[PDB]
Amino acid sequence: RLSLISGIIARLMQTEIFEEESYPVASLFERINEELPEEEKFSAQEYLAGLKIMSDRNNLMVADDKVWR
Amino acid sequence: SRFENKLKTTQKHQIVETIFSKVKKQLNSSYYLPARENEFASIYLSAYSAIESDSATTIYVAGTPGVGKTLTVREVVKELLSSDFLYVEINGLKMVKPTDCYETLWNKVSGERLTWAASMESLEFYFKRVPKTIVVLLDELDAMVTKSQDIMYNFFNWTTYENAKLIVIAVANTMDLPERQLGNKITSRIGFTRIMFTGYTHEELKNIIDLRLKGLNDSFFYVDTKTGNAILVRKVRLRMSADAIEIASRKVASVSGDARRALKVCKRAAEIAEKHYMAKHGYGYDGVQTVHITHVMKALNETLNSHVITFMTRLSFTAKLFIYALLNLMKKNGSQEQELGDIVDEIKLLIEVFVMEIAKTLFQQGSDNISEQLRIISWDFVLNQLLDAGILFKQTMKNDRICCVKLNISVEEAKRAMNE
Amino acid sequence: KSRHTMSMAPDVTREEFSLVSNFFNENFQKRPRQKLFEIQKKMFPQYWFELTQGFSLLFYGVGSKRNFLEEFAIDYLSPKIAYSQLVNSIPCLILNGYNPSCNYRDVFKEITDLLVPAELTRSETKNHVILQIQKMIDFYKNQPLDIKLILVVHNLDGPSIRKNTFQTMLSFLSVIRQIAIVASTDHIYAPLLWDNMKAQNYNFVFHDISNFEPSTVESTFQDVMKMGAEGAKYVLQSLTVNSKKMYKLLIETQMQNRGTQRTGVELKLFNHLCAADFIASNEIALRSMLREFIEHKMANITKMEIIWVPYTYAELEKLLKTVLN
Amino acid sequence: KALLQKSSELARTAEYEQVMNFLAKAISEHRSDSLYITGPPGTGKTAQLDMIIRQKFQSLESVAVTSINCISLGEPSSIFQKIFDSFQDLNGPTLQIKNMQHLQKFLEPYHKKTTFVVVLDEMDRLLHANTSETQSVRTILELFLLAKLPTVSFVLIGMANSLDMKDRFLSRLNLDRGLLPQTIVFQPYTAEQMYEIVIQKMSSLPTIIFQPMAIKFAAKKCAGNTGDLRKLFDVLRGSIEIYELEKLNYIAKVFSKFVNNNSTRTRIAKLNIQQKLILCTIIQSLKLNSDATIDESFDHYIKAITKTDTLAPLQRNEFLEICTILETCGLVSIKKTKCKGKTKRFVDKIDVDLDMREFYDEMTKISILKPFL
Amino acid sequence: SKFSFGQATPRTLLGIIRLSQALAKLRLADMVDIDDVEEALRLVRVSKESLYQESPTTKIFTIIKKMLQETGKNTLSYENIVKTVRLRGFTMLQLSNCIQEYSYLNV
Numbered sequence A: 001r002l003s004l005i006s007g008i009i010a011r012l013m014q015t016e017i018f019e020e021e022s023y024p025v026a027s028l029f030e031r032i033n034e035e036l037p038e039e040e041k042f043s044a045q046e047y048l049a050g051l052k053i054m055s056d057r058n059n060l061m062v063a064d065d066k067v068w069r
Numbered sequence B: 001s002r003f004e005n006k007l008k009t010t011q012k013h014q015i016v017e018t019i020f021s022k023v024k025k026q027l028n029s030s031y032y033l034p035a036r037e038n039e040f041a042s043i044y045l046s047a048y049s050a051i052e053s054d055s056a057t058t059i060y061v062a063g064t065p066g067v068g069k070t071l072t073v074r075e076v077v078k079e080l081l082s083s084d085f086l087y088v089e090i091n092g093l094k095m096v097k098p099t100d101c102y103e104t105l106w107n108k109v110s111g112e113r114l115t116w117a118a119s120m121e122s123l124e125f126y127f128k129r130v131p132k133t134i135v136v137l138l139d140e141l142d143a144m145v146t147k148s149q150d151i152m153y154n155f156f157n158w159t160t161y162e163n164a165k166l167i168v169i170a171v172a173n174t175m176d177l178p179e180r181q182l183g184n185k186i187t188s189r190i191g192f193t194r195i196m197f198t199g200y201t202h203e204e205l206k207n208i209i210d211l212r213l214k215g216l217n218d219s220f221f222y223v224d225t226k227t228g229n230a231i232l233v234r235k236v237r238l239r240m241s242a243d244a245i246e247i248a249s250r251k252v253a254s255v256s257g258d259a260r261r262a263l264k265v266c267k268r269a270a271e272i273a274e275k276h277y278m279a280k281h282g283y284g285y286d287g288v289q290t291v292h293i294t295h296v297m298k299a300l301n302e303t304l305n306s307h308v309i310t311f312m313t314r315l316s317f318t319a320k321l322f323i324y325a326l327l328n329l330m331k332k333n334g335s336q337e338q339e340l341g342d343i344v345d346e347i348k349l350l351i352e353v354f355v356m357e358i359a360k361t362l363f364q365q366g367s368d369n370i371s372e373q374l375r376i377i378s379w380d381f382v383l384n385q386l387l388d389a390g391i392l393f394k395q396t397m398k399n400d401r402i403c404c405v406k407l408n409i410s411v412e413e414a415k416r417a418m419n420e
Numbered sequence C: 001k002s003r004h005t006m007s008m009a010p011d012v013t014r015e016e017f018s019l020v021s022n023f024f025n026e027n028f029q030k031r032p033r034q035k036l037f038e039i040q041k042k043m044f045p046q047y048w049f050e051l052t053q054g055f056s057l058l059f060y061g062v063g064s065k066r067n068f069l070e071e072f073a074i075d076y077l078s079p080k081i082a083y084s085q086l087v088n089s090i091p092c093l094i095l096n097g098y099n100p101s102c103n104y105r106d107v108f109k110e111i112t113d114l115l116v117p118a119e120l121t122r123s124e125t126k127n128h129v130i131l132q133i134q135k136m137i138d139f140y141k142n143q144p145l146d147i148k149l150i151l152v153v154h155n156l157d158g159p160s161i162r163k164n165t166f167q168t169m170l171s172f173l174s175v176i177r178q179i180a181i182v183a184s185t186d187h188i189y190a191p192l193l194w195d196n197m198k199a200q201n202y203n204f205v206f207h208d209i210s211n212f213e214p215s216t217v218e219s220t221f222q223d224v225m226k227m228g229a230e231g232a233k234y235v236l237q238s239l240t241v242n243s244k245k246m247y248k249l250l251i252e253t254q255m256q257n258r259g260t261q262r263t264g265v266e267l268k269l270f271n272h273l274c275a276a277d278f279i280a281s282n283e284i285a286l287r288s289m290l291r292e293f294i295e296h297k298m299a300n301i302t303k304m305e306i307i308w309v310p311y312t313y314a315e316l317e318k319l320l321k322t323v324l325n
Numbered sequence D: 001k002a003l004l005q006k007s008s009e010l011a012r013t014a015e016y017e018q019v020m021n022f023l024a025k026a027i028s029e030h031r032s033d034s035l036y037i038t039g040p041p042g043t044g045k046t047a048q049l050d051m052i053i054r055q056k057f058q059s060l061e062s063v064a065v066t067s068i069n070c071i072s073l074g075e076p077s078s079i080f081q082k083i084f085d086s087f088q089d090l091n092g093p094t095l096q097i098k099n100m101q102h103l104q105k106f107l108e109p110y111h112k113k114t115t116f117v118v119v120l121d122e123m124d125r126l127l128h129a130n131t132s133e134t135q136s137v138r139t140i141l142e143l144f145l146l147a148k149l150p151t152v153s154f155v156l157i158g159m160a161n162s163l164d165m166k167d168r169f170l171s172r173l174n175l176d177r178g179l180l181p182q183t184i185v186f187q188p189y190t191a192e193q194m195y196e197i198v199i200q201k202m203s204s205l206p207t208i209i210f211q212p213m214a215i216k217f218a219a220k221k222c223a224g225n226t227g228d229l230r231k232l233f234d235v236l237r238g239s240i241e242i243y244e245l246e247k248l249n250y251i252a253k254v255f256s257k258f259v260n261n262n263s264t265r266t267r268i269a270k271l272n273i274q275q276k277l278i279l280c281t282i283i284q285s286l287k288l289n290s291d292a293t294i295d296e297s298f299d300h301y302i303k304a305i306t307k308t309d310t311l312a313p314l315q316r317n318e319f320l321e322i323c324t325i326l327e328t329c330g331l332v333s334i335k336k337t338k339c340k341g342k343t344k345r346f347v348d349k350i351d352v353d354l355d356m357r358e359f360y361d362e363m364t365k366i367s368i369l370k371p372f373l
Numbered sequence E: 001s002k003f004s005f006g007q008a009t010p011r012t013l014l015g016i017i018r019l020s021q022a023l024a025k026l027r028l029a030d031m032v033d034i035d036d037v038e039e040a041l042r043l044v045r046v047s048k049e050s051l052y053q054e055s056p057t058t059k060i061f062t063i064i065k066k067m068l069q070e071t072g073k074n075t076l077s078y079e080n081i082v083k084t085v086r087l088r089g090f091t092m093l094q095l096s097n098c099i100q101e102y103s104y105l106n107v
């Protein structure tokens, strides 16, 4: 369930729409409901836990609070 | 040191300092920098920390030649003499054998001449025993890598000792060098600083020219009209058209971004106006002047244009007879590499397919007594003349029939120059 | 050409092989082996008597003879001859022919020091080896006849001793009466080594010894594919944890389809696949830790841009369930 | 603000706890365990044992245990010379250090009968020296033989990069012989033992030494391919001068140096539309996958430009300069390869780092190369 | 090459003439128009075609390249290029931007 959205995040991270390896919280909110999967994105706590389980598997960590490394 | 006293002689009979002589004095490649301004700090702030803290680090810079990396690191250490170290220029290509740099280091600590073996013993004995400061430049690192990497492992293993009073500065040709020649065990020791130097840009290439043209651009000379001697009877001026300087920049930054190539094409274009000025008046060697755009148009092209086309049409007849036979086989067979006997087979056939007065002369220089020649006159000569010219190429065989011949220049331009 | 191959074999690791091999070679046919060894023991006085005649004794036969020669030379003969001449006993100089590092210079430098340095033979040291031994021979023709040295040459068809400039060197040694030459070979084409010139210098005699020994020491230098699928089996046990995962994703779709080229994967999609599990950032970060699989020759590439593993169909699932999992 | 970060750049490890068990007889003066210490490179492993012996020598009874670096020998003699240097004596050195049996006479001590252990540093220079089963494996074989009868034995501690060396051992040696067994490896510390040493190497702590979770972020997103976190702090020490120069920020600065020209800055290299034409001309000559000369490329350049008359055919000398514009950006490399007719003769073969997938995007925007394809 | 087959023959030209005559015969006309030959050539090219199964400054670039192919001078004094841009249809702001872009591209 997170592999398809991780591949979507990776193919959107492949271009210069984030302009770095990092990406803002505004682009984080822009890439969850405005994109293709509808009602797959539940509450703030489970996607923050999804970013944390991507973080210990070295995919998407949490730093500086205005962007997300 | 010693013999520069003996390199001086006395009689200097008043050499004529003309208009363009004083340009080439400052257009010499010798004498803060605009282009690599901030990266000078990135070296220096990496260097200033280790110097004033008694450590051992490594600094790795790369780039194409002509970008100042020979220059910039000399400007690093130069100001540092004002504020504990021993400066050495360990050039890679200036070592005859690669082990000979080892002799220099042990020479440049106390003054002893020991073998490459015995130096690095005491060098290793230095680098882990001395209680507590050495700056070393490892220039042109393509030379000292070639044999078996056993030299290159040493020059970074000395950096690992915390009791090693040394600061190394490597300058290479390419950033790729510890990834396509060295091992990973060296690549751990090289670090990951990796300060990249790009080319120069054409705006900065204008900003490097006028640094040489600081006190002399559009200035005035004092000139006698009789000898052509200029002094910083008329009082003439000389101006440099900046647009021609700009079109010098927009090519050299485009192809190479080389700081020698930019200065030298200005230096070559300067002397074109020198001889044309000497042509019109003849002051020899004993209203307002300028340098046109038309000078740098020629001299930049003078870097490009060839003559092998003009060489071929100014060759002998049997030379042009030879190549025309050679392209005939290459379009007959399509194999681009023909046997030598078949060419001698062809030049016979290309006779009979004025021609008789040719064919008399083509096999004997007149003379009824000594005619009837198999291969043509001077056939060894033109084939030797086409060989050392670099146009042709012929593999070595004692058989003078089945030795193959390969072209070395493009065969179309050979076809094209043949048409004249 | 459906051939059964050694790759399609149930393989055996290092400690598993050598221990059960050591069980057989010390317990298979133990009783009849010493039963042979007691039978041939009565031949030992016969060898002592013929060897006084300066006869180059040569032992052929199946099986290793290395243990048998060292019992016969060291313990039996070398003190027996010293007692029968009348003090340290007779010096034994073995030559391990199965050891390929035997040269002609080094062993002869031992020989002239093993033999008497009665004169300044270092003066004649200047290839003077045949020259120096010729001056040794004619002097030895007029000496009192007694053995002072016995040399042993194990595995005379060995990788260095069978070289021809070394063979003729031993030929001139054998004509001397003071030294007894007890050697063994194992080759089936060993009498191709000598003509009637050398055997004139040799005067060989022959005896069979066949104890069907396992050749423990003589198996060590030799190698087969037991001694790569097994080579890269150890590098993966010490790497980063990410390389295990990116090889796991490599090994799956490369075994999704022997392991040949056709089961391989394109570089672009594999970059996207290892971007899908948040592993590969881009091509460079993929390729750099893929050059480490390239540098230890753990994967191949041919042309789609196909990277494929050169191990078999059976091997990759063994690499799956054991080291990757 | 300098002196807090001037000091920034400079028992202690959780691997030393292993080796005191592995040296469990080194304080009871008996022969210890069997020590062949390997490692993947960069993992601190050279200074790891150096940390142990320096903590051994500063702790430790008569005290003489020496360590030498096998770099510049290629030959097994002068190691046994350097163990004599802790004696400060004089003897006949050449024979005693050459033969296997000559080492055995050297192992009778003089003053108080303290046993000696040698440390062989950087053994892989002699492993990856000259041909294996002739000299170097024999050199490996001869050193690991400890069949000496008194407990004064030359215990080896050797080190290597690549882990093929155990299978290189002969089957006799792999029968539990000498110091080969305990193949103590060191997996590369992700962040869980190396970063905590950096914490204790921050004993003298400045106030702003940066948000340490970003340092934890630095450790987690460097541990893909790394082994040396102080050196990967030496890339933090360069970025800590960036915040001094401006009075994982730098890993972001360094990767865009490497990733670009194929996706975006290919057209940066070819502002000339003819440079776009000459770049496709190279790939059309790559059909004949041969030694791609500057002439065979010039052959296909003329014979296509006479068909489609997009420009006039230019010079070979121009063709020399234009392909060097393709060179300095880093797209195509030129090498002087081999042709063996008369001598080693050097024709120039090129190679391109672009693919047709990254070609076809940037040419459909320009229909003037569309005749040429 | 690889996807090629045969060559153009005069019998194919005669067949094209015959197919145009058949197309004119199907329209019951006494003359052959231009509509039959363009249909017959489309027919003979689509008979083998089944095997495969803006210009905002580019126009100014082609105009500059036409003037560069007749004389070949990259001067700084443009007096004819500005007149053909004024009679070509577009403005001068795009012309000045194209001049600045190709002077930055150094043509």
Ligand SMILES: Nc1ncnc2c1ncn2[C@@H]1O[C@H](COP(=O)(O)OP(=O)(O)OP(O)(O)=S)[C@@H](O)[C@H]1O
Binding pocket: B029, B030, B033, B034, B035, B036, B064, B065, B066, B067, B068, B069, B070, B071, B072, B208, B211, B259, B260
């Ligand atoms: N920024 C600059 N300011 C002034 N002079 C410069 C500058 N850059 C280069 N030069 C001059 O041009 C010369 C070119 O030499 P460098 O570029 O320093 O050598 P390089 O770049 O290392 O090329 P090498 O030595 O063959 S690798 C220098 O010696 C200076 O004389």
Ligand SMILES: Nc1ncnc2c1ncn2[C@@H]1O[C@H](COP(=O)(O)OP(=O)(O)OP(O)(O)=S)[C@@H](O)[C@H]1O
Binding pocket: B160, B185, B188, B189, D013, D039, D040, D041, D042, D043, D044, D045, D046, D047, D048, D160, D161, D193, D194, D197, D227, D228, D229, D230, D231
């Ligand atoms: N866990 C650690 N504890 C203390 N210092 C360490 C540690 N890890 C790394 N270092 C230091 O950082 C350096 C990095 O290791 P390297 O020397 O580059 O690799 P190595 O020590 O040569 O091991 P190799 O590459 O297998 S020979 C070490 O030499 C130590 O100075």
Ligand SMILES: [Mg+2]
Binding pocket: B090, B136, B137, B138, B139, B140, B169, B170, B171
């Ligand atoms: Mg240097």
